Write a protein that binds this ligand. Structure first.
Ligand SMILES: [Mg+2]
Lengths: 418, 417
């Protein structure tokens, strides 16, 4: 088969003989009309126009400059819907930065457009400003819950977002607008604790019994998140579907849709070849752990996962990197991280924990920019210059006849064992 | 003797013997606290917090990128005042661009700062968007009056701005926030018509019988402009005084103060030396006309006005330039302009008109950038390199013994007889 594997700003072309292939596992109206249909057909609530009637302090939570939410399309339609029975509504748009540094004005202009940034009230969440946080409750796990005060003070709290798989929260969107999106840095870090990450339900496309998700769901309830609009978007960031209404029920209908498109069924193989979805999704090693998890799920214990990830920006986190650089082997990394309690979670630790989980049971070979070979070696992986060399290395480790699972885009799929 | 004349980013030095000098004619506690004092002591109205109580939709008109209103100081205090007895007021800030192109986001950041631009609702007036203009009346002069719908629709309409001399409206501020600030393009052009601009009361520091002013006051009344805050700023753009309240009474009080500071008495001389006040006020010839009018007031008929103005950006308007380049002499420009009726004002016409008025009865020498010389000659004026040069040319035209009035900053003064 001539397989095209996303890589940086290109694709890699690889001729892999069909006899070597287990399976090649791939994921399966105007944009504005898709959005209006959702809004006009809310799942589990009244229409937003009805919810917003007579309210005097509305807050819409939106995603930040780092997320692909097509807000130039979605925000005007939400604002119009809000105003249909409340022309003089006060509406604040609160940017859910989570842990991140604040969105800059240039970034706001790029995301939302100049007129919208000017004409409406945008406020940037700062997870590090305690004065603007309010304790609102205690979570199922026992942790405190602190969120942005503006959200708490709102007469009606709304959020927008998008839905795609996520390698430990199951999916993006819905409740994530609250935790982590507008939560305190401490609450965010606690929501990534080693105990949570180790749970067997903290996996791609898994929500039920997922304790990370359980805390988020409770956070959203306690925040009185009353309505969401979540989109599903293609590679190009074009809206292809949309779900609106109850913050849980509408999110689930969207996740059900995404599960149907993204789920692939794998017979585990001795070798898996995958990628991290090309640039910008493959910009660093940190991000490439996501594609590796799709690998892990399609690989036999002790097998080899080959991942193509350009990683133009290097390792993607000093702390992430240092966990490996400073330890004996992946089991050492895991043991260190698991020794960390719920209030001791440090930035990057969860990404290291997941990569250690992979590397304890599997070898990983990274096809990556030569700038990164030493990093890859330092992280108990093996660099390769191209897919041909990667396959020769894998074959040395297993056999030169092993059937191979090919997952051309590792970050877009939910791998289910067949 | 030692005079310093603003020119671009700095000040020219030049040494002038006092036998030749008629007169040197110049103008005369925290900024936050000054604004707060004005708001706490409104002129001819209750406090803005009282006026805003119970009003759901509120609009504050603020000046555009061309005006140095210190809005980083003034807007938060206005917003605070409006919200005192009305925490859920829906407040829009409408930028009064008048005839100008719209303010860019970068310019909004510079003027208002990032947080304020984000956190509040800022709307840019577009005089050319007719669907967004509403007919609200007919002026004292007979013209239609159409202004931005957001303002007409407000429960309370408020404006901020600043008070300084203005070469044809008398003073800036107050009513000017409405017409031209948020008026239709057609109305703006009508308000600068040849018949208004020719009027002998359409002049610096004159409001009484000024027909331009008359139309603007009528427009602010029709628009229900309910409260203003207008500051007075020194040369640094520091707030030195402030006046709030009734849109006419508070403005008049502020204009009387500016009159006290800015008025200079000149005995007409054969030569005047002046400037357009330096960067950013002397960036093009269009703007320099403003300072030439102070020269005009201080100069005998037939005399010589020398004005220092860098004019880095050149003429300041293709429209304005073409008036002169497509005409025989200043009188011919004037004849074409005064042929045009109230509805036929072309873009930049009024600036050309005023310059032609000057050039009909005075010779103007511009000390300006060498790249501007052809433009200066095409516009029936004489370019010069530095003042020493200018003076030599001006003595060639009049006497070698002729008296000089010096007006170091031609845009900050009101020249009285
Ligand atoms: Mg804004």
């Amino acid at each position: 088969a001539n397989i095209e594997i996303p890589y940086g700003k290109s694709k890699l072309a690889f001729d892999l003989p069909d006899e070597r292939i287990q399976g090649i596992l791939r994921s399966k109206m105007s944009e504005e009309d898709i959005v209006k249909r959702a809004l006009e057909n809310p799942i589990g609530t009244k229409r937003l126009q009805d919810l917003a009637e007579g309210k005097k302090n509305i807050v819409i939570i939106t995603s930040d400059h780092t997320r692909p939410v097509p807000s130039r399309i979605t925000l005007p339609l939400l604002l119009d819907e809000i105003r249909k029975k409340n022309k003089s509504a006060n509406v604040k748009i609160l940017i859910a930065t989570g842990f991140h540094r604040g969105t800059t004005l240039q970034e706001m202009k790029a995301k939302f457009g100049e007129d919208l940034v000017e004409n409406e009230q945008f406020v940037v969440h700062d997870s590090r400003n305690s004065e603007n946080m309010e304790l609102i409750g205690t979570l199922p796990s026992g942790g405190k819950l602190e969120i942005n005060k503006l959200a708490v003070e709102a007469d009606l709290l709304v959020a927008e977002g998008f839905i795609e798989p996520h390698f430990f929260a199951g999916f993006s969107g819905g409740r994530k607008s609250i935790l982590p999106g507008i939560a305190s840095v401490q609450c965010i870090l606690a929501n990534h604790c080693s105990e949570f990450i180790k749970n067997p339900y903290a996996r791609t496309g898994v929500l039920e019994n997922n304790p990370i998700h359980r805390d988020m769901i409770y956070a959203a309830k306690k925040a009185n998140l009353a309505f969401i609009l979540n989109v599903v978007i293609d590679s190009s960031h074009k809206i292809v579907n949309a779900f609106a209404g109850h913050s849980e029920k509408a999110h689930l209908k969207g996740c059900e849709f995404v599960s149907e498109i993204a789920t692939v069924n794998a017979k585990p193989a001795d070798i898996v070849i995958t990628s991290n979805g090309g640039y910008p999704l493959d910009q660093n090693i940190y991000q490439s752990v996501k594609g590796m998890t799709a690998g892990e799920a399609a690989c036999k214990d002790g097998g080899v996962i080959i991942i193509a990830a350009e990683c133009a920006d290097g390792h993607g986190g000093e702390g992430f990197y240092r966990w490996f650089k400073e330890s004996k082997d992946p089991q050492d990394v895991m043991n260190k991280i698991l020794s960390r309690g719920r209030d001791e979670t440090l930035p990057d630790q969860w990404e290291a924990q997941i990569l250690a989980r992979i590397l304890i049971n599997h070898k990983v070979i990274m096809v990556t920019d030569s700038k990164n070979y030493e990093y890859v070696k330092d992280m108990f992986m093996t660099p390769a210059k191209d897919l041909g060399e990667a396959l020769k290395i894998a074959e040395s480790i297993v056999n030169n006849d092993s059937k191979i699972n090919v997952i051309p885009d590792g970050v877009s799929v939910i791998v289910r064992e067949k």
